[PDB]
Design an enzyme around this catalytic site. Sequence first.
Site, PDB file in Angstrom:
ATOM      1  N   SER A  69       0.860  -1.079  -0.114  1.00 22.73           N
ATOM      2  CA  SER A  69      -0.017  -0.001   0.120  1.00 22.73           C
ATOM      3  C   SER A  69       0.842   1.176  -0.019  1.00 22.73           C
ATOM      4  CB  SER A  69      -0.892  -0.015   1.201  1.00 22.73           C
ATOM      5  OG  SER A  69      -1.935   0.961   1.086  1.00 22.73           O
ATOM      6  N   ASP A 284      -3.644   6.114  -3.437  1.00 24.61           N
ATOM      7  CA  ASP A 284      -2.243   5.646  -2.751  1.00 24.61           C
ATOM      8  C   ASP A 284      -1.649   4.517  -3.754  1.00 24.61           C
ATOM      9  OD1 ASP A 284      -4.174   3.605  -2.646  1.00 24.61           O
ATOM     10  OD2 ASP A 284      -3.558   2.835  -0.578  1.00 24.61           O
ATOM     11  N   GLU A 380     -12.554   6.851   5.859  1.00 32.70           N
ATOM     12  CA  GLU A 380     -11.822   7.497   6.841  1.00 32.70           C
ATOM     13  C   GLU A 380     -10.959   8.876   6.185  1.00 32.70           C
ATOM     14  OE1 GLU A 380      -9.968   3.867   7.617  1.00 32.70           O
ATOM     15  OE2 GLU A 380     -10.195   4.234   9.812  1.00 32.70           O
ATOM     16  N   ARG A 505      -6.577   7.266  22.437  1.00 31.36           N
ATOM     17  CA  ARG A 505      -6.443   5.835  22.503  1.00 31.36           C
ATOM     18  C   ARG A 505      -5.272   5.333  22.196  1.00 31.36           C
ATOM     19  NH1 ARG A 505      -6.451   4.999  17.541  1.00 31.36           N
ATOM     20  NH2 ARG A 505      -6.783   2.654  17.423  1.00 31.36           N
ATOM     21  N   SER A 507      -2.493   2.829  20.285  1.00 36.62           N
ATOM     22  CA  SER A 507      -2.356   2.505  18.810  1.00 36.62           C
ATOM     23  C   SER A 507      -2.448   1.045  18.550  1.00 36.62           C
ATOM     24  CB  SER A 507      -0.757   3.093  18.373  1.00 36.62           C
ATOM     25  OG  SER A 507      -0.730   2.640  16.855  1.00 36.62           O
ATOM     26  N   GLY A 508      -2.184   0.206  19.554  1.00 35.68           N
ATOM     27  CA  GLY A 508      -2.347  -1.154  19.397  1.00 35.68           C
ATOM     28  C   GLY A 508      -0.944  -1.962  18.854  1.00 35.68           C
ATOM     29  N   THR A 509      -0.151  -1.442  18.681  1.00 34.44           N
ATOM     30  CA  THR A 509       1.459  -2.213  18.275  1.00 34.44           C
ATOM     31  C   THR A 509       2.495  -1.603  18.724  1.00 34.44           C
ATOM     32  OG1 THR A 509       0.373  -1.213  16.281  1.00 34.44           O
ATOM     33  CG2 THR A 509       1.602  -3.160  15.814  1.00 34.44           C
TER      34      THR A 509
END
Length: 548
Positions: A69, A284, A380, A505, A507-509
């Site tokens: 991507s 993209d 988004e 919040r 990031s999760g990583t």
Amino acid sequence: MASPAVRKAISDAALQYAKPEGKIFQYGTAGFRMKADLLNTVVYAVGLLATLRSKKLSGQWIGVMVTASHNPAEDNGVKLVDPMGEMLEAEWEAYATKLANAPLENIGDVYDELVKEIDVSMENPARVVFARDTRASGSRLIGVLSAALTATEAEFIDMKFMTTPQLHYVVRCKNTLGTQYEYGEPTEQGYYEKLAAAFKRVMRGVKVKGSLTVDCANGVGGPKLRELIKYLPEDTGLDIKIVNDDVINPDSLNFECGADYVKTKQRAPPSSKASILDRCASLDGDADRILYYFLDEGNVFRLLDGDRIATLAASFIGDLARSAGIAQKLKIGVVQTAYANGSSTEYIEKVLKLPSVCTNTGVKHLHHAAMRFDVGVYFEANGHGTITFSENALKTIKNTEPQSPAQQRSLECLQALTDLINQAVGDAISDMLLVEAILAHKGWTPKEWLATYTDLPSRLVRVEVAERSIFKAYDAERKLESPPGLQAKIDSLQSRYNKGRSFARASGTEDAVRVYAEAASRSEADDLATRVANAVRDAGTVKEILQA
Ligand SMILES: [Mg+2]
């Protein structure tokens, strides 16, 4: 529960490759994605997973897309696409992960482990379609994928170079032929014809004004856009100028263009030669994201991002549903994340008079929520999005009897939109056609579209913390349960600012949290973001243990 020759062929072909150092892998959103020289054994594992997914699902075609991507030339990636062109089922991510993390000498047995845990019927041959973007490692990785599929005795088709949406398109078509809801001819050609024919209907008796300069990220979207243009109708007044199509040089991919670059740095590509007021867009690298922009009269870069496109689409669908006389019959709504500018949400609720649903971040939650409406609009900010049409929606469009030529025209127009807008996945090219059509129908310049509402100044910051895991969110990630008292303080901070809104919040990583804040003025937005940023940092530094 079979077979011997397959087990042997699996472990034999695996012996061609070697696992990188001590790399632990995880199949996240969009799959596996990392430096291309770490990826041989990973793509192998996915070839194997794909065989199992197809077989579990009665030998339906399963897709694999090789792309990374937005990422620089030296990354690549790999993701499975389920039969209807939807993203791989959440629970199958964990299988991919189990296979990637296996030692290679044992991978044939983990395959057996899975044919037993998943309960797969071996009557059916596996069938997998794949394609890739323009990356240099593509060819090697397609060879790896193909060695896996051969070891499993799968049937496969190499669809060559495609955009990501084109590969979701093909998968869905292949699995819908002969059906009641045939998605189209499963070729690149069919993709173009379908887009062309629908654009043509949407465009009946109206005209695009001025050119569109499309930055194609030096990616696969560039040659595909050019090929599509050959299929488009003539008297629509669409004039597309393609820039950044330097696909032959891998180093050029996503280098200081297109969509991710424009969005995150909030400026035009430096190489851009567009003039004042020239309407522009950036795709993209795998063409599933797009945004618009232009230089205004005073020579200032003006971004029109995913949310801008969302409110554009929602305004158009709202007006059409009303004049088609079905706006009372159908549930129409915009789905957003908390990252959406407050002014965009205000416009939807106050001016468009449509629901907005805030949901968790990640296309998965956004899509699932958009499918709760008959006509669900989701983008988004980053330029990923689409419009979902329920069966009810399609049916009531298809079946309603019109009581005026306007009502009929709207129903036809709406019917066409249904074939123009990619139903499987957010599609930069489809979205492009959409925006152009809407601007044509509304008679809007880029400047009239921007003038539609004014963004509240906002600021996003990345706050490093000791442990990402103590920050636990709920309510579309707008509130923290944990750590204690932080929300109470975020609540109090945002209240001191005119139209002040902030949330943090994980990031999760990483071991980082993201702070978003917006307000009526710049200084307020920045100050609120900094204050929340400090509280976050404070609550996120190791507590420190005392003695005696
Ligand atoms: Mg993409």
